[PDB]
Nucleic acid binder design. Structure first.
Lengths: 142, 87, 365, 150
RNA sequence: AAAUAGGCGGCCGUUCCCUGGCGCUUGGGCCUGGGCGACCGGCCCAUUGCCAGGGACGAGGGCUCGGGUAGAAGACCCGG
RNA sequence: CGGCCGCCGAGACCCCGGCGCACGGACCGAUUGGUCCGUGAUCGGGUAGGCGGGCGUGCCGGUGGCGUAGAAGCCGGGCCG
RNA sequence: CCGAUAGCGAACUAGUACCGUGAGGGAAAGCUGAAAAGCACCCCGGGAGGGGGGUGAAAAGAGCCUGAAACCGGGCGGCGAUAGGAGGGUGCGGCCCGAAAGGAAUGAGCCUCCCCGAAGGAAACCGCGGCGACGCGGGAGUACGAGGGGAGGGGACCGG
């Protein structure tokens, strides 16, 4: 159905619009998770993400919150947390969602048009990180 | 003929259901304004095999072009996704 | 609480302690490339000896006599079955395609009098037949269609990443198996085309200790350690003893944990598998390479080995061999693979061909 | 009685056993395993069980008993007593069927089902002045075998 | 069993007949008016395909046996 | 944080039909009870407790019925309350 | 009045079996059928066991009238080896059946036209405001709408 090219688009806004559409039962495929943007002070963003991974929920039963290290999976975990994967609809939705690493597609993408909060202008926004950089530091791949 | 046709949820607060009516987005309708042409149109959930659920719409939901619909019977939810006809 | 600390017993760094996934060792981690030369080689552990060497091996003298325990290992010659190609994906390294060699020489094989039916063994590698990996079904045809597939990969050109080799043993004197153990070894250089040329020459060739590896280097060893079976909390983790005299207790952990938290942690000592675990032990000095054993006609760089009466639990050693310093992980008769070191000590230099004053000739019994 | 349909004149032959002094649970594993085979295979199957060759897999009741190698379910055991006893039931269907004008060897076993019958009950000692039931179960097992041939 | 549920190389399964009924049901080529094309109409081919009645063949693997470098059972490894 | 506009969103409130209660009116009966109409916006949650109506069980009496062409009882289904 | 977990301790082998040194304490245990015809004769089986045939009727075949529940086997329908919990209610899909007590061939699920119609109640489109979000007037209390009536087609289930 949809091929989104998610270069230049803030993560939260992109993840909401997608999460809703998947519940409608209409496939979204997000391409280029890395090229994506997260707004805010980088210290804090990293600290927050790192902390999730750090557990040791007990001391490792291999249960309890985990968080992965690559920009792709960080994103794939995010759209899913916006989804209710416990229920039937959500579960069906998670299979409807796919993340692709790099671009393998030969075809043109699509976008969420609005520039209010869902596309950056890098000079205008005072503080940002690109999602791939925080993933390299965490241990994952660009 | 038919225009799609998506059942997303029931009219519902976060905590209440309201089983009686469902909220729909038809495709083409951008606005509260377009949705009113759909009023009175009969909506049918089709399922594999033959059993048949009619309902009408009867009210505008939006803001943006959602419409509410009532059925004789009601909808499982199982289909979040039904179709509406141009009758 | 006395407010006294107890440092942790056992590691969780060689955990989880559970059976190997194959009798063959596995590998992900490959050492440094700097030469167009074979990486990784194999043997069977023969037994052990002790050796007197002249230091060499930098340490607390660099000229007095030094005792070093030694593992004598019979290495089979190996035969590169195929060339495995990799392509780099998005998610990790995946194998593009392979050339195998269905094609059949007759094996340097011996065995057997009785005599009336010598019944020919003349080995197309009937050892491939005994290997449970299957085979076409038109030898010539298959090799060529694959070779053409290789030619493509070389052409494209940078689609292709590195080259590794599917390499298998040749049992041609060892009585502890007669079925090829099949493995992967990498072929390093510094750029794909040089690895591609070398692997292609290599495939029809029965190869040595000499080809792969040089004396006086430090080497890693990869192996599945000897299986104990299940062993106690005492054995697996280490447990201390207790108070005035305990009949009842003695081999015991007491607490598994508190009342809330209402769970069992995985770090508390319990019974379960010990041994038959995979281990890589770093930096073992290559004492020696030779071939035979028992007699050699020159008197320096060995005079030739093998205790009389064999070794307890090992057949006759007669084929290419390596004598490596200190402990080797595994049991007697187990396949071990050897890995060059990724980096060796640097506060202690390697020094080539270490001086071998004398070799044991007494049995382990 | 009998707990399945009949057409005994020319397509069914029946027999039943009453108050066999045998385990009902071990009768459950054999009836299920044996079910659906022809008589001859069923003889062969029973003979192997007695030799202590082919295991009877434990399935519905299965707890705290060692596994057994091969294809078929993890635990299993050998109920020698039951195999001997059931062999007699089967032999009786076979002699009868022949008078009835059925050829036994071809007939497939549709139905075999076990019934927990009356309970032989008493006491054996435990400590602290107390006695506890010490019981043997007595079991009925029915077999109704049916023709199938072309 | 990473649900984005992997990658490779090899090995396998990879069917018949009478009689009745059907075939742009299935599949291809050509002409011309209409169509960008698929498609309608005209021409040409099928040892064929389909339904109903009966019908073949059997790669891998365990169990088996002799022992263990393995092991509470089971498993594992090796040899036959 | 200071304004504003459009919406969403209860069993509430509005609205059709029905039901009980309370009260009035009428009728019916041999007692209890029942029915028909009207009024109720200002009647309808509910533990202790108070009251009021019905149901069921065993046997007795009167009365009036049923049963081997199948009673009670048992098990599943249908209908009413 | 009770009616066999009741009523006498006890419908009977009861003041028994049994307990306790003793004084004393103390149960449970009713039903074949018309006739015992209480199982011959025949087949099978080591067989005193057990199965078929043999009775008006053996869910009348030996603590045998009836023959519940818990529960146990098998079979039928449904679900079933990636997925969430007072085990359900309410509403709707799939599969399953339903002769029987129900309504419906004097027309079921279902389709279609027309009208009446409580509370409620638009749009397109037009003109004018409002910084804007959006609002007024007209369309228009119209379309629609719970609920009610007639006609018409199809042809078997619908509730449950």
């Amino acid at each position: 159905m949809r091929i989104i090219n998610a270069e230049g688009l803030i993560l939260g806004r992109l993840a909401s619009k997608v999460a809703k559409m998947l519940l409608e039962g209409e496939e979204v495929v997000i391409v280029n998770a890395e090229k994506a943007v997260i707004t805010g002070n980088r210290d804090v963003i990293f600290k927050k993400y790192k902390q999730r991974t750090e557990l040791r929920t007990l001391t490792n039963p291999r249960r309890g919150p985990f968080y992965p290290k690559r920009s792709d999976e960080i994103v794939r975990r995010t759209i899913r947390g916006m989804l209710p994967w416990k229920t039937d609809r959500g579960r069906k939705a998670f299979k409807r969602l796919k993340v692709y690493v790099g671009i393998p597609k030969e075809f043109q993408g699509k976008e969420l048009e609005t520039i209010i909060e869902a596309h950056v202008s890098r000079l205008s926004r005072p503080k940002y990180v690109t999602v791939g950089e925080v993933a390299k530091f965490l241990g994952g791949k660009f | 003929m038919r225009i799609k046709g998506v059942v997303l949820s029931y009219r519902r607060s976060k905590e209440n259901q309201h089983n009686n009516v469902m909220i729909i987005k038809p495709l083409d309708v951008n606005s509260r304004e377009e949705a009113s042409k759909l009023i009175g149109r009969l909506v049918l959930w089709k399922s594999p095999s033959g059993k048949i659920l009619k309902g009408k719409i009867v009210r505008v939901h939006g803001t943006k072009g959602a419409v509410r619909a009532r059925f004789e019977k009601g909808l499982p939810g199982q289909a979040l996704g039904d179709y509406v006809e141009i009758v | 609480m006395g407010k006294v600390h107890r440092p942790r017993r056992g590691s969780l760094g060689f955990s989880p302690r559970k059976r190997a996934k194959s009798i063959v060792p596995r590998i992900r981690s490959w050492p440094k490339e700097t030469e167009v030369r074979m990486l990784g080689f194999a043997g069977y552990k023969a037994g052990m000896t002790h050796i007197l060497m002249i230091d060499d091996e930098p340490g607390l003298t660099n000229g007095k006599e030094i005792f070093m325990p030694v593992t004598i290992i019979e290495t089979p010659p190996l035969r590169v079955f195929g060339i495995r190609a990799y392509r780099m994906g998005y998610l990790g390294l995946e194998t593009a395609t392979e050339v195998i060699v269905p094609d059949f020489p007759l094996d340097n094989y011996p065995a057997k009098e009785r005599k009336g039916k010598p019944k020919p063994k003349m080995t197309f590698y009937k050892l491939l037949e005994r290997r449970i990996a299957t085979l076409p079904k038109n030898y010539t045809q298959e090799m060529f269609e694959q070779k053409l597939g290789q030619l493509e990969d070389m052409i494209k050109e940078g689609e292709i990443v590195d080259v590794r080799a599917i390499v298998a043993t040749q049992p041609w004197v060892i009585k502890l198996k007669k079925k090829p153990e099949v493995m992967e070894y990498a072929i390093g250089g510094t750029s794909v085309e040089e690895k591609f040329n070398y692997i292609k020459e290599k495939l029809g060739k029965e190869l040595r200790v000499g080809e792969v590896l040089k004396e006086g280097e430090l080497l890693d060893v990869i192996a599945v350690t000897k299986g104990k079976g299940t062993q106690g909390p005492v054995k697996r983790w280490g447990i201390k003893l207790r108070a005035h005299k305990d009949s009842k207790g003695r081999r015991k952990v007491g607490s598994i944990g508190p009342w809330h938290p209402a769970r069992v942690m995985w770090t508390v000592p319990m019974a379960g598998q010990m041994g038959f675990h995979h281990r890589t032990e770093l930096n073992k000095r290559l004492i020696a390479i030779g071939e035979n054993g028992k007699l050699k006609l020159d008197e320096n760089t060995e005079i030739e080995i093998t205790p009389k009466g064999g070794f307890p639990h090992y057949g006759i050693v007669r084929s290419d061999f390596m004598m490596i310093a200190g402990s080797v992980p595994g049991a007697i008769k187990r396949i071990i693979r050897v890995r060059p070191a990724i980096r060796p000590p640097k506060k202690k230099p390697p020094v080539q061909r270490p001086q071998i004053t004398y070799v044991s000739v007494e049995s382990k019994q | 009685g009998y707990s399945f349909q009949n057409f005994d004149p020319k397509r069914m032959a029946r027999a039943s056993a009453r108050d066999l002094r045998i385990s009902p649970k071990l009768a459950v594993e054999v009836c299920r395993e044996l079910r659906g085979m022809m008589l001859n295979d069923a003889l062969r199957y029973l003979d192997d069980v007695i030799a202590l060759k082919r295991p009877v897999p434990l399935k519905r009741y299965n707890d705290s008993q060692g596994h057994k190698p091969g294809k078929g379910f993890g635990p299993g055991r050998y109920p020698v007593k039951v195999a001997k006893a059931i062999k007699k039931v089967l032999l009786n269907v076979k002699n009868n069927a022949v008078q009835k004008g059925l050829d036994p060897d071809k007939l497939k076993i549709i139905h075999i089902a076990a019934h927990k019958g009356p309970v032989l009950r008493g006491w054996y000692p435990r400590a602290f002045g107390r006695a506890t039931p010490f019981n043997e179960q007595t079991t009925h097992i029915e077999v109704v075998v049916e023709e199938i041939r072309r």
